């Protein structure tokens, strides 16, 4: 548990990765605000189900009470979808790969009121990961940090030790990629500073979804409705 090596920690996290899902995108017709919001939230809803399983496999997560598990997921779920999205869009300059059959450029984001700003931020985060050459091993550490960190200062020492262990795991990966000791702490800082930008995007994405709901643009699943409400 708290006794995994860096190597076993990476192994578990890679093991636990969710699958890439497909969208029900219908290329027979052009997008509308409703149909596009429909595809995206249908996708998010199915992704959330796999996210729940993934979270239960993150070291230390199943040790928490059910209530704290619920709270962490309620705090982190959109951040987690977003970094997932940014990761898979990395080798797709100027495009967001929501699904292998749903690859969107920012001009297509225009058809939903207020989407393109969030598009622009997602695209910038993706470029930033590409320019840092973010590795898969580092990506699954970040995603675990998000899950454990984002709800933690909002209602604990257990979670803090596991977070410290992921930090050690991150440092270990950089060390074995051959970065000098200075580069290790510089790169550790750069990665964690991006998490602040991912929190911001999450906050922006949550308000946008709320507004889509308030305007009756699309029907939201009960899970998604309850996620939104937590906010």
């Amino acid at each position: 548990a708290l006794s995994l090596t860096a190597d076993q920690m990476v192994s578990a996290l890679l093991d636990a990765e969710p699958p890439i899902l497909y969208s029900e995108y219908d290329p027979t017709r052009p997008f509308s605000e409703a149909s596009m919001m429909g595809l995206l939230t249908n996708l998010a809803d199915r992704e959330l189900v796999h996210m729940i399983n993934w979270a239960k496999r993150v070291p230390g997560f199943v040790d928490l009470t059910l209530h704290d598990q619920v709270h962490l997921l309620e705090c982190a779920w959109l951040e987690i979808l977003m970094i997932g999205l940014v990761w898979r869009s990395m080798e797709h300059p100027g495009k967001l790969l929501f699904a292998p059959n749903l690859l969107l450029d920012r001009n297509q984001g225009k058809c939903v009121e207020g989407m393109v700003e969030i598009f622009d931020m997602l695209l910038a985060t993706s470029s930033r990961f590409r320019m840092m050459n973010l590795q898969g091993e580092e990506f699954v550490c970040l995603k675990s940090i998000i899950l454990l960190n984002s709800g933690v200062y909002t209602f604990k020492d257990h979670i803090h030790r596991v977070l410290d262990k992921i930090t050690d795991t991150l440092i270990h990966l950089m060390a074995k990629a051959g970065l000098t000791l200075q580069q290790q702490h510089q790169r550790l800082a750069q990665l964690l500073l991006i998490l602040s930008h991912i929190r911001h995007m999450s906050n922006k994405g949550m308000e946008h979804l709320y507004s889509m709901k308030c305007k009756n643009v699309v029907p939201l699943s009960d899970l998604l409705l309850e996620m939104l409400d937590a906010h």
């Binding site: 189900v49 729940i52 059910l66 598990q69 619920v70 997921l73 899970l223 309850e226």
Partner: peptide, 11 residues
Amino acid sequence: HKILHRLLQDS
């Protein structure tokens, strides 16, 4: 209790 509370319990 919340939908999630329950979902979190299955395997």
